[PDB]
């Protein structure tokens, strides 16, 4: 097995939520989990994070969880459960913030966090051959194409571009901070 607790609970949580959305409908689940979309929702703290848990298409959940399982799982095994927790909380909160800024609160997906993990695993392999956390050359290629497809909207349901940029930024910023060690 190569799923730590944290890699695993996140996969589970995303699956459960995705089931909820097929059963109750997307809007119904958004209503409960979306970034605050009204002044009356601002103290509902779970919302600054739980938008990460919602997926809108089968290809969305599947690609997000494939990358999570892999990079997230690499990060947990080599660097520990708490590092992945903090990349995750920070990426989710910060991507959510920039996404709603540009485009308002109706958005969801783990891909702000996947982008943080991509940028993080890459830049920390490059400035620290010693976690050994690294992003394998073939996988930098598959990651770049992924990045590109979002930016130029190559998927055919439209994309949380704020959340993507913010996500990657946070992952770079943290790899930077982390590698600047010994």
């Amino acid at each position: 097995e190569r799923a730590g607790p944290v890699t695993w609970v996140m996969m589970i949580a995303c699956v459960v939520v995705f089931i909820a959305m097929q059963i109750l409908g997307d809007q119904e689940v958004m209503l409960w989990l979306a970034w605050p979309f009204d002044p009356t929702l601002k103290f509902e703290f779970w919302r600054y994070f739980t938008h990460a848990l919602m997926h809108f298409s089968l290809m969305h959940i599947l690609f997000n969880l494939l990358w999570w399982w892999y990079l997230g799982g690499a990060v947990e095994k080599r660097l520990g459960s708490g590092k992945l927790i903090v990349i995750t909380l920070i990426s989710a909160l910060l991507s959510g913030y920039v996404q709603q800024k540009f485009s308002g609160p109706w958005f969801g997906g783990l891909s702000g966090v996947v982008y943080a993990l991509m940028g993080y695993v890459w830049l920390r392999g490059e400035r620290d051959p010693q976690s050994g956390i690294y992003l394998q050359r073939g996988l930098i290629i598959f990651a770049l194409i992924w990045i590109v497809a979002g930016w130029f909207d190559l998927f055919g349901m439209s994309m949380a571009n704020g959340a993507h940029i913010a996500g990657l930024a946070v992952g770079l910023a943290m790899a930077f901070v982390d590698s600047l060690n010994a």
Binding site: H51, W106, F107, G108, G112, N161
Partner: peptide
């Protein structure tokens, strides 16, 4: 909606 927008997908992240």
């Amino acid at each position: 909606v927008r997908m992240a």
